[PDB]
Symmetry: C4
Subunit: 219 residues, 4 copies
Amino acid sequence: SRPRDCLDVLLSGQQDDGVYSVFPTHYPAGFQVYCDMRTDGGGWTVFQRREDGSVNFFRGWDAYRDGFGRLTGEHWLGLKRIHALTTQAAYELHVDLEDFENGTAYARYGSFGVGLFSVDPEEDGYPLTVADYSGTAGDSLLKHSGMRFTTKDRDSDHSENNCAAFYRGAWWYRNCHTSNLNGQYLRGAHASYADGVEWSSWTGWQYSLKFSEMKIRPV
Amino acid sequence: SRPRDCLDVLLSGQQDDGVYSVFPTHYPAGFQVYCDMRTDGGGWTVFQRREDGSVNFFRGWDAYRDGFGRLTGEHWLGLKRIHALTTQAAYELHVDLEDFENGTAYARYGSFGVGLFSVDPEEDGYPLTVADYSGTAGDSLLKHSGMRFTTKDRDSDHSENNCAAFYRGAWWYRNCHTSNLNGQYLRGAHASYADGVEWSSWTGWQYSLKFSEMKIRPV
Amino acid sequence: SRPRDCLDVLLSGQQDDGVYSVFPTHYPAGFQVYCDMRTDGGGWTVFQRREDGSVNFFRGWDAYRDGFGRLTGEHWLGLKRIHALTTQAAYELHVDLEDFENGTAYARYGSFGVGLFSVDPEEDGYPLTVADYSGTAGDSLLKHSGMRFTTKDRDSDHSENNCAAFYRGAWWYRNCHTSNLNGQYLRGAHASYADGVEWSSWTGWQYSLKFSEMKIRPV
Amino acid sequence: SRPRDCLDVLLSGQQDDGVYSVFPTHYPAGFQVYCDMRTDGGGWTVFQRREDGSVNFFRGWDAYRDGFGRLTGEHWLGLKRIHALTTQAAYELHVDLEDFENGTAYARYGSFGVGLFSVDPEEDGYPLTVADYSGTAGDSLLKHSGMRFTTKDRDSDHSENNCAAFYRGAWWYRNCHTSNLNGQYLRGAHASYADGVEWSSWTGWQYSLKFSEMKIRPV
Ligand SMILES: *[C@@H]1O[C@H](CO)[C@@H](O)[C@H](O[C@@H]2O[C@@H](C)[C@@H](O)[C@@H](O)[C@@H]2O)[C@H]1NC(C)=O
Ligand SMILES: *[C@@H]1O[C@H](CO)[C@@H](O)[C@H](O[C@@H]2O[C@@H](C)[C@@H](O)[C@@H](O)[C@@H]2O)[C@H]1NC(C)=O
Ligand SMILES: *[C@@H]1O[C@H](CO)[C@@H](O)[C@H](O[C@@H]2O[C@@H](C)[C@@H](O)[C@@H](O)[C@@H]2O)[C@H]1NC(C)=O
Ligand SMILES: *[C@@H]1O[C@H](CO)[C@@H](O)[C@H](O[C@@H]2O[C@@H](C)[C@@H](O)[C@@H](O)[C@@H]2O)[C@H]1NC(C)=O
Ligand SMILES: CC(=O)N[C@@H]1[C@@H](O)[C@@H](OS(=O)(=O)O)[C@@H](CO)O[C@H]1O
Ligand SMILES: CC(=O)N[C@@H]1[C@@H](O)[C@@H](OS(=O)(=O)O)[C@@H](CO)O[C@H]1O
Ligand SMILES: CC(=O)N[C@@H]1[C@@H](O)[C@@H](OS(=O)(=O)O)[C@@H](CO)O[C@H]1O
Ligand SMILES: CC(=O)N[C@@H]1[C@@H](O)[C@@H](OS(=O)(=O)O)[C@@H](CO)O[C@H]1O
Ligand SMILES: [Ca+2]
Ligand SMILES: [Ca+2]
Ligand SMILES: [Ca+2]
Ligand SMILES: [Ca+2]
C-alpha cells in the first residue's frame, strides 16, 4: 500500500520496469519514480538518467534540489527526494554506463547517501557519502566522498573557481572531478576538457557517454 | 473515509451533485471539488467551469497553478490539483459546452493528464496528455496534445508571440489553438479573433460560449 | 486520538477549558487552540480574544492569514486555520462581549464560515458567510455577510478608501462596518469614530469594549 | 512505529545512543535527531551540541529556525523542531557542560518549552519557558525565562543594542545574558566580554567551554 522505495514495490509483486508511487519515511506525501525491476534481481529506484541530450542538465541550485526532466526519459529526481530515500535506510548505488560504440559498463557502491546527518541538508549542500566500489566501469566516485553538491549559482567545492560553471554540470565537486554524469551531452570524443558526461576511470576526461543511469536499493 | 476523487465519493453512496473532500495519493491533505454525479452515471471531478463571466480568467502563472474562483460557480481548480488527480490513475476528460441559443454539445477523451511523468510538473509547464475523442462538439483538443500550459507571464508555446497574451486566456497553446475555454467571456459572436471561450470544431473562432465544464473520471 | 475541533475534544472526555490539539480534515498536521468547555454545554473552538490591549491587532495580511498573539491571552488564530475549521463541517459562531462597567452580552450565529467554496481562500480574501442571529448584544455582523477580509495592506472592501487603514483594524469590511472587534484597544468611550473594539448594536460606534471572544461549534 | 521523541524510541527497545526518526504530534513528516540513551536512564532528544568549533554558530534567524550542522557533531536542531517537540508534552531540559581541564557539570530544568502557546511561534520569537533548576553547573537560564530568541538580524531583546550581534551568538537575550551556549568557540579563557560558549554560574563571563549538549525528555 505504501512502499518506501522500488524494492518494496518489487516485493509487493510488481515485476515490470516503470513509474511507481513511493512514500519515504520523512516524505509521507510521496512521489513517483522509475523502478528498474531487472538489474541484479531488481528493486532499484532511479534518480538520474542521460540517454539522448533532449534535457538541459546545466541547471541552477533550485532545479537540482527540486528535480527536472521526465521519469520515462532524461531526468534528475532532485536532491530533496534523494535525501528522503537515502536517509530512511542504508542504500547501495548502481551506475549503468553506455558509450557510442554500444559498449556498456557499471559501477556498484555498497554504501551511498546525500546529506545523511545534515540537520538542514539543503543549507549543508547535500554532501556525498559513498564507499565500497565493485564492477567493470572502474571507480570515478570515491574521490568525491564527503564533498557538498555544487551548481553554477552555488559554489561549495575545493577550487578557487566554480567547478560546476567550469565543467558545465552539477556534482559533488572537489578540485574538480573524476566523474561528471550531469555534464553537457557532447556525444563521444570532444576537444573541451572534462565538461561532458564523463566517467574518467572508463572513457577518460574527453569522452561524453551516450547513456547513464544512477539508481539505489537498500543494502 | 478518504475518497481519492468524485468516483470514490459516488461509490461510497453520495449520489447528489455538490462539493466534497477528496484526497489524491500524493496530495494527502486533500481539498474540496465539485462532483458531477449525473453525467453518464456520474463520479466526475470538475476542474473548470464558465457560466456567466463573473470571474476573471485572464490570470497569471501562480493563479493557474493554485486555482481561483468558487467551486459552486466559475473556477479553475488549479494545475497542481489537476496533476495530483490525473497522475494517481488513468482518467478520461468530459467537456460540456452550451451556446447562447441553448444548444449543448460534449467532447469525451478516453485519456487525459497534465505533467504525467514530469519530475517537477510546474517547471515542466504541466504538459497536456489527451487522446481518443468521441461526442457531439467535435475534437478541438487533440492538436494541443504534448503542449506545455502558457499564461500571459510564462510563455512555453510554439508562437514567436505569447499565445496567452494574444488570445487573452491560458491553455496548452501550440501556434496557437483550436480551443480556448479559459478565454474572455465575450458572450456569443465577436469581431476579435479567437480570444473568447472558443471550441472551434463546434462554433468556430469568433463565438464565445455561455457555459463550459471540464471534468475527469477514472477510465 | 484526532479530534477535528473542541467539540470532538469535549466528547472524548476532556471537560476543562484550555489549550488542545485539533486536526481539521484538510489541515492534517493539526494545531493547538483554546477550547471553551463551559458556554452552552461547551465544545467551542476560540479564534479571537481581546481582554487587555497587550497584543497589537493593527497587523497586515500575512499576520491575519497566519495568526498572532497567544492562545492563553489575546490572539487571532489565523484565517488559514479558521478556513480549515469552518469548511470541514457546518459551524455556528458565538461572540462574548464585556464593557468596562462589567456588563456582558453575546451574539450567536446559526451559520458561520470563511472562504467556504473558494478554490484559493487567500486569493479570494476569505469571504464571510454568516446567518441566523440570536442573543443579547444585537446583530452587528449580518451586514458583513459575503464581504472579503480587508487589512491595511490588502483592500477588498466597498469604500474608495481602505476601511482597515481608516478604522485601524482588520475585518470583512463593506462601507465600512457595524462591528470592528479587531480594532484598537481604546478602553471605553473615545472621540475617534469607530476605530476601537466596536460592536455597534450594543455600545455604539464610539465605545471600545474590554473583552471579546469569537468561537465556533458544529451546528 | 511512530515514536514522538527519543523516550518513545528508548521504550520501544532501542538502547544505543545515535540518530533516530521521531514524529511530533504537529510535525507528522517527522525528522531525525540524536538520542542520548545513557543520561539518568536515557530517552533524551538532543537539540544543541558544541564540541570542537567546526560549525559556525554566528548565524541569522532562518538558520536558527531551520537548524544547521550535523546530528553526529555540532548542531542546532532548529527552533521550529524544538517548538514541535516541547508543545506536544511537558519536557525537562538537561544541559551537559565540559571545560578544557576535563571538568564536567550539568543543569536540569524540571520545565522547558519554546513558543509554548504562540499562535505563530516564529512571529512571536519562540519565547523561552524554563523553571525548577537542579544540578552542579548552577543556574544560568532562569533569568532568560519569558524572553524571545534574538539573532544578529532579528532583535527582540531588552537592550537598546542587539545582544546577539554584541555577544556574537543567538539566545533568549534579556539585557543581555547569564548563558550564551551558541556563542563563538573561543576555547577557554578570553579577553573579550561574554561572547564565547558561556555558562556564567559555572565558569564566569570570560570562559568559552569545550563541550555543551542541550536535550529534552518528557517530565
Ligand atoms: C547499437 O545498438 C542499437 C540497439 O538498439 C542498434 O540500433 C545499433 O545498430 C545499428 O543501427 C541500426 C539502425 C542498424 O542499421 C544496424 O545495422 C546498426 O548496426 C547498434 N550498433 C551500433 C554500432 O550503434
Ligand atoms: C434557455 O434555457 C433557460 C432555462 O433556464 C431559459 O431561461 C430560457 O428561456 C427564456 O428566458 C426565460 C426568462 C423566459 O422568458 C422564456 O420564455 C425564454 O424562452 C431558454 N431559452 C433561451 C432562448 O435562452
Ligand atoms: C468587575 O469584575 C471584576 C471581577 O474580576 C472585579 O475586579 C471588579 O471589582 C472592582 O475592582 C476590584 C479590584 C475591587 O476593588 C472591587 O471592590 C471593585 O468593585 C468588578 N467591578 C468593576 C466595576 O469593575
Ligand atoms: C581529557 O580527557 C581525554 C579523554 O578523551 C584525554 O584525551 C585527555 O588526556 C590527555 O591527552 C591525551 C592525548 C594523552 O596524552 C593523555 O596523557 C593526556 O592526559 C584528558 N586530559 C586532559 C587534561 O585534557
Ligand atoms: C576535471 C578535473 O578536476 N580534472 C583534474 C585536473 O584538473 C588535474 O587536477 S588538478 O587538481 O591538479 O587540477 C588532473 C591532474 O591532477 O586531474 C584531473 O582529475
Ligand atoms: C487561434 C489560432 O491559433 N488560430 C489559427 C490561425 O492563427 C491560423 O493558423 S496559423 O498557425 O497559420 O497562424 C489558422 C490557419 O492555419 O488556423 C487557426 O487555428
Ligand atoms: C464605520 C462605518 O462604516 N460607519 C458608518 C458611517 O460611515 C455611515 O455610513 S456611510 O456608508 O454612509 O458612510 C453611517 C450612516 O449611514 O453608518 C455607519 O455604520
Ligand atoms: C552579558 C551580559 O549581559 N552581562 C551583564 C553585564 O552587561 C552587566 O549587566 S547590565 O544589564 O547592567 O549591563 C552585569 C552587571 O549587572 O551583569 C552581566 O550579567
Ligand atoms: Ca569554488
Ligand atoms: Ca511564444
Ligand atoms: Ca477600498
Ligand atoms: Ca535590542
